[PDB]
């Protein structure tokens, strides 16, 4: 081995393991008793602890706060985020293709080959998409090889940048590596390889970071006020007037005008002027960082109503039908559209079942409206009329007895 580790151990399993063993031993010196306790519990209950780490943020603020699982989540997350790599490292792990919205088998486990057919279907499915990742995950510093465990046909080869938190540790005979996913994945390239007599897809993947405040709405509100206080004071009197009219409930008229294509077949100069001013307000201080926002959608956005049989997502067939209709598709909103920096459920939309989780590229049109005094309880980011979103992936989760959907989407204009 060299004195300095490589960015990628590749197939050098023996050095990867030894290095990470020394690393586990060094990090033991920086974990307090509670963090060590958190790790032990994770070793014993990893699946449920990871599961909690993926969907904890979607409940009421007070439900999150009083869940005793928060202690484990917080203490383990702190153990990880502390131990930051000082240059990039590549990691390896197997995923279900379903995770990247390929809802069928690439090949069965008893087959050894992957058809060009499947290969091309997978490529078209995972091309040109940013897939959101959450929660705790065990990864390998070396590529799985002959006699390694390989649960699926999809191997992810992920590059992680400098300052990524990684927790090297030992679980009985094995040296492991824990991360908490907090980014989106781009699959730059897929290739078919062979390991121990079977074909696997290897995905060359990298990450895109975004600000995601999740349930930390105070941190998100500080960020918003930080960045949009003078936007609040830089609007023309016309723009401020029209924004406040919009926010005060003028939105319903303005947005229905837009959705009905009023500008074409029923023009109205008064409304057109307001639409223009609001748009110009949203271009005044473009979204200053990649940002995740959340919207609790009415079913009508997805062609459903409250009493639509297909809105019963407690039945898996209805989830499948939703995915077949929407997953991988791009949708457009002729209206201006409200989102929040927070993921928490709220009284006003406590029962809405469809959550949009949207990646907003830096410099997109948009504004943290809640930087205007009067109604900041929304933690609102208003997006521009005519926005287009690519739906990357549909997940589901339980909110009590009710199955709800999370739509991993990206703003593409």
């Amino acid at each position: 081995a060299f004195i300095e580790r490589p960015e990628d151990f590749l197939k050098d399993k023996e050095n990867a393991i030894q290095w990470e063993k020394k690393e586990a031993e060094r990090v033991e010196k920086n974990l307090d008793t509670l963090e060590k306790e958190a790790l032990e519990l994770y070793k014993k209950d990893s699946e449920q602890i990871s599961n909690y780490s993926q969907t904890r943020q979607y409940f009421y603020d007070y439900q999150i706060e009083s869940n005793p699982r928060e202690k484990e989540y917080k203490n383990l997350r702190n153990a990880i985020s502390k131990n930051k790599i000082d240059k990039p490292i590549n990691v390896y792990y197997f995923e279900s293709p379903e995770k990247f919205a390929f809802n069928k088998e690439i090949r069965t486990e008893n087959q050894n080959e992957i058809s060009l057919e499947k290969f091309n279907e997978l490529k078209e499915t995972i091309q040109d998409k940013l897939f959101k990742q959450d929660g705790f995950k065990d990864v390998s510093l070396y590529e799985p090889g002959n006699g390694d465990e390989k649960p699926t046909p999809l191997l992810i080869h992920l590059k992680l940048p400098k300052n990524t938190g990684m927790l090297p540790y030992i679980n009985s005979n094995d040296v492991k590596t824990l991360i908490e996913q907090d980014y989106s994945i781009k699959i730059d390239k897929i290739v078919r390889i062979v390991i121990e007599g079977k074909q696997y897809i290897k995905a060359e993947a990298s990450i895109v970071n975004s600000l995601d405040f999740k349930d930390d709405v105070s941190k998100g509100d500080l960020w918003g006020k930080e960045n949009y206080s003078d936007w609040s004071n830089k609007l023309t009197p016309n723009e401020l007037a029209d924004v406040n009219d919009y926010m005060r409930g003028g939105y319903t008229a303005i947005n229905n005008y837009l959705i009905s294509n009023g500008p074409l077949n029923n023009p109205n100069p008064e409304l057109d002027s307001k639409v223009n001013n609001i748009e110009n307000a949203l271009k005044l201080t473009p979204i200053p960082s990649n940002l995740i926002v959340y919207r609790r959608s009415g079913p009508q956005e997805f062609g459903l109503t409250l009493t639509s049989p297909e809105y019963d997502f407690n039945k898996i067939e209805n989830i499948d039908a939703f995915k077949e209709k929407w997953e991988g598709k791009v949708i457009t909103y002729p209206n201006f559209i409200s989102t929040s920096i927070g993921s928490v459920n709220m009284s006003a939309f406590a029962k809405r079942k469809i959550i949009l989780r949207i990646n907003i590229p830096k410099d997109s049109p948009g504004a943290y409206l809640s930087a205007i005094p009067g109604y900041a309880g929304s933690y609102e980011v208003l997006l521009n009329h005519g926005s287009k979103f690519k739906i990357n992936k549909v997940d589901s989760y339980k909110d009590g007895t009710v199955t709800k959907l999370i739509l991993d989407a990206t703003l593409i204009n």
């Binding site: 009421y60 603020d61 007070y62 005060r248 409930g249 009415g298 109503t305 409250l306 009284s347 006003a348 939309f349 406590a350 029962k351 809405r352 079942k353 005094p373 009067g374 109604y375 309880g377």
Partner: protein, 355 residues
């Protein structure tokens, strides 16, 4: 010399004199484009318009007309001669209360005024400074937790679901029964049916079985032209909407759940006091059976050892106004009035320092 109390709502203005036990005037919060029952006496060349929407003033020109009508036509006083207490919704924007203050001093030239939070006044009407208020009117409903006289803004819940939505829902389900209630005048009729015949069922699914199985729950109502109609399960399906907003297509928490959410947003140390002092005010809390039903729903959500009390006085339709009448007439309140002189010295933003 005598202070005025003007409780401005989405549907009705309640106005009168501090020290009286009831408002002298209650009239509709509408303008014609004329105010109140004048705005509909000639609603031909004109249309009825509601300046206060979901508890918030949205049109200042129209609101000036409402206040004009209040002083000169309803109370027959000069604004220049009376300190005037106005009420506002919880979480009323700060620019709204500044604009209310500006209009009072610069348009009406009042000698003094004050703006009080409606829910705080209704709590005070029952002699309390600590409790959680369910205030439900024509346009909006709030849960407002209050501790030692201070509303707790981070724990306030607002639902845009109230009496007018219940009226409109009743029109629809009566129409599905075989009647036809659709026009603006028919909407007034159905509001009347709602106010006289509706109630909240203690057990809703049970109540729906009963009604399906008997005429035991049916009631009759005589229309203005003498046609007598029947109303059955609509009596309780109508206000059931408050607990189940999906009845009108809304995916919000119902009023029991917003009450619980509000309490859960408060400091743990004060939650027992809130549970023990759930107070109801406003016209849409007048349904027989609503207190019992809330008791049952909150009992299901809260810890089994929790002592829950719902307070629903017979006067609660006017308890915001009554609270204002008591407040404005207190010795220790007199120092709190914003005088015209204070307005001249300090801007409209004087409201924030004094309230």
């Amino acid at each position: 010399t005598t202070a005025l109390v003007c409780d401005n709502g989405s549907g009705l203005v309640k106005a009168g004199f501090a020290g009286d036990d009831a408002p002298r005037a209650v009239f509709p919060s509408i303008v014609g484009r004329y105010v109140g029952d004048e705005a509909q006496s000639k609603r031909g060349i004109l249309t009825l318009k509601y300046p206060i929407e979901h508890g918030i003033i949205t049109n200042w020109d129209d609101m000036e007309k409402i206040w004009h009508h209040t002083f000169y036509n309803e109370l027959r006083v000069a604004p220049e001669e009376h300190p005037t207490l106005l009420t506002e919704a919880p979480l009323n924007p700060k620019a709204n209360r500044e604009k209310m203050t500006q209009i009072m001093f610069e348009t009406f030239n009042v000698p003094a005024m004050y703006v009080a939070i409606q829910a705080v006044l209704s709590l005070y009407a029952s002699g309390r400074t600590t409790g959680i208020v369910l205030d439900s009117g024509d346009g909006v409903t709030h849960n407002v937790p209050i501790y030692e006289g201070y509303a707790l803004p981070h724990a306030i819940m607002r639902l845009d679901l109230a009496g007018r939505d219940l009226t409109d829902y009743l029109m629809k389900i009566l129409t599905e029964r075989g009647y036809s209630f659709v026009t603006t005048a028919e909407r007034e009729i159905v509001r009347d049916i709602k106010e006289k015949l509706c109630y909240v069922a203690l057990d809703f699914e049970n109540e729906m079985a009963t009604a399906a199985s008997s005429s035991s729950l049916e009631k009759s109502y005589e229309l203005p032209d003498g046609q007598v109609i029947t109303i059955g399960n609509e009596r309780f399906r109508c206000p059931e909407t408050l607990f189940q907003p999906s009845f009108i297509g809304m995916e919000s928490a119902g009023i029991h759940e917003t009450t619980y959410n509000s309490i859960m947003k408060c400091d743990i140390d004060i939650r027992k006091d809130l549970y023990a002092n759930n107070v109801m005010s406003g016209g849409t809390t007048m349904y027989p059976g609503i207190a019992d039903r809330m008791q049952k729903e909150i009992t299901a959500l809260a810890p089994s050892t929790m002592k829950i009390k719902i307070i629903a006085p017979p006067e609660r339709k006017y308890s915001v106004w009554i609270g204002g009448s008591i407040l404005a007439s207190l010795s220790t309140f007199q120092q709190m009035w914003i005088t015209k002189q204070e307005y001249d010295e300090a801007g409209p933003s004087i409201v924030h320092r004094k309230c």
